Amino acid sequence: TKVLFITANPNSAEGSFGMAVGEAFIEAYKNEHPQDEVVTIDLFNTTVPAIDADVFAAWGKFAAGEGFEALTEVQQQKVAAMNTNLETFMNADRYVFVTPMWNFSYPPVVKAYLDNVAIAGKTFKYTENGPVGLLEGKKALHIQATGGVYSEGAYAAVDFGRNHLKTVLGFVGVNDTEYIAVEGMNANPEKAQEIKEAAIANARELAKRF
Amino acid sequence: TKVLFITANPNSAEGSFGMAVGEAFIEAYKNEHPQDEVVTIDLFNTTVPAIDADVFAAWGKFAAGEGFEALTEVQQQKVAAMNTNLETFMNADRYVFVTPMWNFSYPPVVKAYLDNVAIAGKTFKYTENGPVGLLEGKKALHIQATGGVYSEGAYAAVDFGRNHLKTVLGFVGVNDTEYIAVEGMNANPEKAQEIKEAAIANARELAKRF
Ligand SMILES: Nc1c(S(=O)(=O)O)cc(Nc2ccc(Nc3nc(Cl)nc(Nc4ccccc4S(=O)(=O)O)n3)c(S(=O)(=O)O)c2)c2c1C(=O)c1ccccc1C2=O
Numbered sequence: 563t564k565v566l567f568i569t570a571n572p573n574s575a576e577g578s579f580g581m582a583v584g585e586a587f588i589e590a591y592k593n594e595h596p597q598d599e600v601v602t603i604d605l606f607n608t609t610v611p612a613i614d615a616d617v618f619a620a621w622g623k624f625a626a627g628e629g630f631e632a633l634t635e636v637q638q639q640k641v642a643a644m645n646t647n648l649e650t651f652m653n654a655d656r657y658v659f660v661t662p663m664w665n666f667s668y669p670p671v672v673k674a675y676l677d678n679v680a681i682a683g684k685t686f687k688y689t690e691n692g693p694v695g696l697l698e699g700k701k702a703l704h705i706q707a708t709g710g711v712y713s714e715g716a717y718a719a720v721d722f723g724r725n726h727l728k729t730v731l732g733f734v735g736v737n738d739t740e741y742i743a744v745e746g747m748n749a750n751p752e753k754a755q756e757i758k759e760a761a762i763a764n765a766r767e768l769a770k771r772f
Numbered sequence: 773t774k775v776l777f778i779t780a781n782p783n784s785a786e787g788s789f790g791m792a793v794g795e796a797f798i799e800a801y802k803n804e805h806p807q808d809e810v811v812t813i814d815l816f817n818t819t820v821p822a823i824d825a826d827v828f829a830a831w832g833k834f835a836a837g838e839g840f841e842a843l844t845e846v847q848q849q850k851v852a853a854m855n856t857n858l859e860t861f862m863n864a865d866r867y868v869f870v871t872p873m874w875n876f877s878y879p880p881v882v883k884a885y886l887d888n889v890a891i892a893g894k895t896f897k898y899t900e901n902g903p904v905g906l907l908e909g910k911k912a913l914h915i916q917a918t919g920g921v922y923s924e925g926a927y928a929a930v931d932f933g934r935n936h937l938k939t940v941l942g943f944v945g946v947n948d949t950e951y952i953a954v955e956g957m958n959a960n961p962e963k964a965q966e967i968k969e970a971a972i973a974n975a976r977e978l979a980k981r982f
């Protein structure tokens with residue numbers, strides 16, 4: 563069983579609630595499954611090429627029957643890095659996302675990463691009725707840290723980071739998805755110590771059954 | 773009146789549906805208000821620094837009473853571009869966003885850009901019970917091209933590009949928002965030109981009253 567620990571939190575001075583819950587999960591999981599391989603993909607220190615003019619130019623050449631050698635050096639580096647992210651994602655059995663909420667969504671790279679892992683012929687295929695996912699036997703956890711409370715109630719409609727990630731996962735075939743919110747620390751800093759520990763305990767219990 | 777034509781498509785108007793509708797709008801607007809200054813901001817050719825460890829360290833240095841000289845060169849370059857993006861956005865009266873739907877949302881640079889224009893003490897401020905916007909007297913349009921139909925009905929909930937952009941715009945204080953969808957060209961290919969032209973007509977009529 564291969565697990566991808568995919569994180570999108572910059573290594574700043576302040577610390578990270580999401581990272582603390584994520585590391586607690588991964589350590590608890592590794593204790594339960596000493597034989598499973600865990601791979602850390604840090605999105606702030608991984609090449610995650612955005613779909614741009616070069617990527618469209620590479621795609622236009624593939625459509626025109628030309629190969630990889632017809633691409634420029636920059637184009638070659640871009641699609642090789644895209645394919646390596648894609649292959650890694652396809653090869654894993656389990657995905658664990660760790661994300662902060664910025665501006666009611668996730669950091670930009672998370673979108674860049676999803677645009678890398680959602681590829682025709684690889685994670686979805688076209689049908690008469692539109693694209694359908696190809697992935698089977700997958701399972702995913704999303705750990706999101708938020709300043710306010712969005713897990714339940716009215717504000718759930720504006721938790722765009724969570725809701726989009728679940729949709730893309732669902733699109734490619736991964737609809738067995740767990741969710742752990744580390745929420746309300748900026749709303750109630752007085753109980754941020756207890757919110758973190760409650761989420762850590764919730765993570766350690768899930769690792770025993772993930 | 774100053775208008776920001778903010779585009780996030782690596783293809784030009786000859787190559788994209790939304791950009792064709794976008795160009796139809798901005799040109800029809802310009803004839804109607806020849807005095808108005810229109811600035812095109814192509815996000816695929818603008819320095820839009822992602823919030824990272826460098827940016828957080830820089831912010832920590834400004835808060836600590838230290839000045840611009842306290843930052844490394846890379847920190848200086850990132851915060852200088854972030855401030856130029858912020859200044860340009862703040863001083864504008866109108867914003868037109870042109871966006872394609874990729875993977876049920878917008879391209880990552882759009883989020884990166886939103887992270888540049890939603891800053892504390894500039895476009896929003898803190899209160900006892902949460903952040904609230906500062907921008908007054910602004911109006912926005914979002915033009916989005918989509919393969920399927922997300923305008924109304926069941927799939928409106930998975931239209932994350934449209935919904936998140938409106939939320940951030942609404943959060944910073946830009947309440948007056950317009951929306952045009954160039955939709956269903958992939959779902960009904962033999963009806964694609966008539967969709968484009970119907971959307972172009974919708975854009976031209978809006979320009980007279982935007
Ligand atoms: N930097 C921050 C920070 S901080 O951690 O660095 O202080 C925090 C932070 N969020 C942030 C969220 C909530 C609160 N405080 C706060 N307090 C109470 Cl008593 N109630 C609520 N309500 C509240 C507000 C928003 C959402 C949900 C809820 S809730 O009702 O479900 O609790 N919020 C506070 S506080 O600093 O004013 O206390 C900051 C943000 C930001 C942003 O930079 C930012 C940029 C663009 C858009 C949004 C934000 C943003 O929200």
Ligand SMILES: Nc1c(S(=O)(=O)O)cc(Nc2ccc(Nc3nc(Cl)nc(Nc4ccccc4S(=O)(=O)O)n3)c(S(=O)(=O)O)c2)c2c1C(=O)c1ccccc1C2=O
Pocket residue numbers: 680681682688689690691692693733874875876919920921922927956958959960
């Ligand atoms: N490259 C594409 C393209 S392409 O045509 O430009 O090659 C197109 C494209 N979208 C895409 C959207 C719709 C259809 N076709 C298609 N046809 C019918 Cl008869 N019905 C529907 N229904 C449909 C499908 C999706 C959403 C909504 C509806 S709708 O019924 O409410 O209109 N779709 C087709 S088709 O190629 O199979 O014909 C591709 C996508 C992609 C993606 O790369 C992609 C990546 C990640 C996630 C999603 C996508 C994606 O959706």
Ligand SMILES: Cc1cc2nc3c(=O)[nH]c(=O)nc-3n(C[C@H](O)[C@H](O)[C@H](O)COP(=O)(O)O)c2cc1C
Pocket residue numbers: 571577578579580581661662663664665666667707708709710711747748823
């Ligand atoms: C740039 C930035 C944007 C933020 N935006 C939001 C927001 O829109 N809503 C919210 O509730 N909290 C927001 N926050 C607060 C963080 O989500 C919160 O501190 C969270 O714990 C960060 O995750 P981490 O602790 O794992 O780093 C923001 C923080 C930063 C630095």
Ligand SMILES: Cc1cc2nc3c(=O)[nH]c(=O)nc-3n(C[C@H](O)[C@H](O)[C@H](O)COP(=O)(O)O)c2cc1C
Pocket residue numbers: 613781783787788789790791871872873874875876877917918919920921957958
């Ligand atoms: C990389 C990529 C991802 C896409 N993802 C989606 C999607 O999730 N849903 C959808 O309906 N259409 C999707 N499409 C189809 C486009 O939304 C549609 O072709 C649209 O016209 C593109 O906008 P543009 O013509 O302005 O570039 C995708 C197209 C590309 C190239």
